[model samples]
Target: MLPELKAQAPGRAPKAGSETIIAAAFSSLLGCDVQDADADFFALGGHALLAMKLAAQLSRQVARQVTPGQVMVASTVAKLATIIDAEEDSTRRMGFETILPLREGNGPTLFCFHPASGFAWQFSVLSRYLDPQWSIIGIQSPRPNGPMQTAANLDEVCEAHLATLLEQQPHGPYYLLGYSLGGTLAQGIAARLRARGEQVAFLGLLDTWPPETQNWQEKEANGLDPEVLAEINREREAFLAAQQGSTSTELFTTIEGNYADAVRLLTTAHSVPFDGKATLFVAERTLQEGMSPERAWSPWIAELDIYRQDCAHVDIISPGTFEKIGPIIRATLNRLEHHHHHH
Candidate 1:
């Protein structure tokens, strides 16, 4: 049996046969019993290769383009079905600086930023471990090919999100968190609010280093396993080659489109600088020699704390990850509950 899936409020009752089809697809593709609606693809032994296969299979059935990135973002029968159905109406597409509520609660919102890939759906796992009172709202950018206009720079991206954020909840003492590129962005977004003297209750960056001026083409793959990324790229290319013709267009644009956002955010956003207090959760395995969180964030932030985790950078948002760090975050948040910082 797969690990127990946390129950979530139903989202757009899966179109006629999509739920069953998706569940079975995951089951047979990964060769596991994916009976639960919330079963995660990675937990089911899914990788980029398997995800592309699943994407191709789902596309063949639904006649809708399902990118492997979408599979990784949705990563479940229910959400995947919901996305398929949602796409039936382009209006439902989460493009632009859209805010996706992973879980709704009557507590102070925990706003999450998407990684450079521009999908916030990965934050769904965080709902499982966060405090009951604290709901989550994930801010995501549009896919390079999707309905929203790709902003020219990071400020444009962050401003669109800020407008949406204030419209939803215009108040102080906000909790923001992100993983990987999103961590850098969360800090960027928090800096925007901090400049205006809004209360930033908590800023948790999971496995993200200082927002460096990275020419991604030159760096050591942002401390990720360059070899693994190359393998992922090669397999994806092989999958695209197998599909042939228009089906290739159905896949996401070049991985560069996704990686470009990382460069844009690191260059355009981090250059603005942040001087607030936040926690940086560093994944020790992803950390390279001479790379230190203190060294990276010190010049930018005022009072920074560090938390090290025994995990890979790629797995920072995985199931076990938040399980370990969520409680520490909760403690920090609760501790900061009474004090609203004033500049």
Candidate 2:
């Protein structure tokens, strides 16, 4: 039994043929291939909340009560299908975001570029708070998901791609947001746009590297280890496969992989000056480590409206941190709207 999912909930046995219905439902809903015999919910991004929803729906349909833990323990499509088979004839539905939806309608669009080892999902938490008129699009890093051909140095490629996105979108005004390495990329894109006579309304840098971070990169680059990354990626797959089915030795390997890449990117990437009048949000605690936020942010502070978020690097993506960020964006939108009205 998998340590992550071995514990099961005691419940009445599932009715005959329930497993097949559940399997079909999961496949239709998640758009993932879920074989009744081998599908695991966690492998498909089904966390505790989603698991509970699925069980409750199944129980109502079968005229019985079910628990989230049971779904996690059972995991496979067949197992869930069996439980659903016993349920009464009620139907359940679950929906989730694949990519963060930008606020609908048209004004100045807010284009967000995510940080290293990050996905577009980071901005999903703040999507609701943004002005309805501003479009928010989160661009994912190309590596792993797509071609890895983009410059290993994120600034070069991210700026280039974003420039293209801005060109294609209705040009009026634009706001940029980036976190960590993404902050650097966002600044670079703004600089490039300004060079092309484009206007950047606001640039938000969230707890990102300053020029000094380049020094750390130079030292870490000498110790590149391709073998380790390959080993870790392989282990990640094995661990994911066994997530809710069996106990595998690969525990928290994904987090380890992310950390390794973060060290590599932050240390080895060449540094550039952040030259723009933008709002910079740094984590108060982020600077306490080897990287000093003031040393890094000081040179650009004249052009920046620096503010500090009371969170760690990763916590910046959490819902609580977004509470601080959403208002800033909303206020920026209000200011921009007022500016347009006067002009």
Candidate 3:
């Protein structure tokens, strides 16, 4: 612990010996009053500088340790206290393993899918930041492969999976969200959900691009490194290995043949057709970096409110991005709920 940070109780509840030290150190480092009740970390003036210090100190204080994002997510004293107790041992945890239980019976649900090499971690933070009135579920892509197979045709696979999940789970109104390829899936899922007679309250696609919207060779020439394509291919192997025994087909052949074709077909051959309401969070930075213009998507995106964020493609899903979009999501959810109620 830094000399400046001395142990102190956050407030009210009896302080546990462990949390007392953490609360004290955090409060001292930030030079701001901290209470057990506040729900936001940045709201309390926590910035990158203090955040790094908190991560270091808390890592040593707790056995499981914490990530920088976790610290930010656990902004409230009580929330932090709870997180400290629950996630201290997550140093080596894997993906999509933790299915967060939504707050008991919160109205209609939102299922978020992370982009490649990403997981539920970002949206876990988003769930905490947003209103708890709606249940938000973020699915982590399974290690190597995603939680579910990346069907050569993602649209069909996603549509079928989402429909199955909705059929089994309690359904009323719902929302779908995804990033990158996941965003494409979100759009597909929303269309499927609507076709099934369930109202889709919101479909939020972050940094999502439609297949056939641009020529792959041109996009790659812009900034997508050819090297990165190799990496995606390499990862696809490990992904197949994870699903091997469970899947009927052999892993290697899958990626080289049908799997690659499937991905290409869905991403390049199939375009997202607008059939329901949606909101697209396009990263201004990506557009500036020579990503294709939305001109071709104007027809499909006409029904959608396309909002631009200050971050890059990946950064658009982080805490900062979520904070910026929080109001939009709230408003969308509210409108959807109201529409469903009246209908």
Candidate 4:
């Protein structure tokens, strides 16, 4: 006989149909019977690693390719089942290889670029504090196995990203935000959009710096502590393992190869001059002394508004840090909306 499902709350009961299947899959991964349709997977000890496993299991169960991004966006059993049903009915298409919908709202769409980790999941926490009317979406890197193609330069990266944006919304007045390396790419993307006669309503950069003129090894040695750097490496390894579902030598090789290509492309590529005004969020902690965030962006951005936060480089995107910056973001978006309506 099948084991009776466990409920998290008194009134809640075991889900049925597709929700049951999804809950069961979560139960298997989380080592508990997740029966509540509204129970959050993350709240039940699930992380990105477990989310990937769940997505793979769901894909097999439903006979479709379910992505980790999808699992993240629809975190509950009921929500995930709803997405599965929708996908089952329609043909899936791809433009942005990895798009994670953070929130469903009627306000202007905000597209967040991925950081060095190639995962946009970090934006999920920030989305919570943003205006409910704003539709937040994260753009991630292509899967390692799916695409061996790496942009030859920053322009190429911007071009590919722009193509993805155009495919989704074929017009002007776009909103963009990015973290770390993503911030650099965001600048490039905004520049490209304007060059093509498209309008960029907002461009936000979060604790990102331009490529240092110094050598990579020197920069790392001088900018980051050895212990901190090691921690970052460990985190990167775990992230890649979760993302690729393997720690094989070949898997490491593929990811490292891609990372190397991205670094080369970013460091060598020249900054595209963007005429529009931009908002820059700077972390209180500094790594190196060569260039301030404003100075780094000044050459590319015509007018820059700087906002400082009390956090380290890594903590800038964390939930705790988002508490400080989220309102600013919402206010900026609101201002844009007001301007659009007033004009």
**TM-scores of all predicted structures:** 0.59, 0.52, 0.53, 0.66
In model 4, which regions exceed 4 Å deviation? 1-18, 24-48, 55-90, 93-105, 145-156, 208-231, 238-258, 287-302, 310-312, 335-343
Per-residue lDDT of candidate 3, residues 205-319 (tens digit): 6664432344232333353545435545555554434332433443355444543443344444344455566776654553445555544655674456666555444344445
Q: Model 2 over residues 1-343: C-alpha lDDT tens digits?
A: 4222212223233234455445554555452665354454533444333454566666775666655334544434545554444332332222122222333356555676654442343355565555433566555432332223323545545654565466566344666676656655565565667676666666666763433433223555564446434544444343334345332433234335454655566554444445555666655554535643454546754456556555545445555777566777666656544443231
Which lDDT values do the candidates have, in the order given? 0.55, 0.49, 0.50, 0.57
TM-score of model 2 (CA atoms) = 0.52
- At residue 277, what lDDT does model 2 achieve? 55
By lDDT, the candidates rank as: 4, 1, 3, 2
Cα displacement (Å) at residue 310, model 2: 3.6
**Worst 10 contiguous positions by lDDT, candidate 1:** 88-97
**Model 4: colliding residue pairs:** none
Residues 271-316 of candidate 1 have per-residue lDDT tens digits of 3446666776655564444542334545556766666565644455
In angstroms, how far off is 306's CA in candidate 3? 2.5
- Comparing 1 with 3 on TM-score, the higher-scoring candidate is 1
**TM-score quality measure for candidate 1:** 0.59
Which candidate gets the maximum TM-score versus the true structure? 4
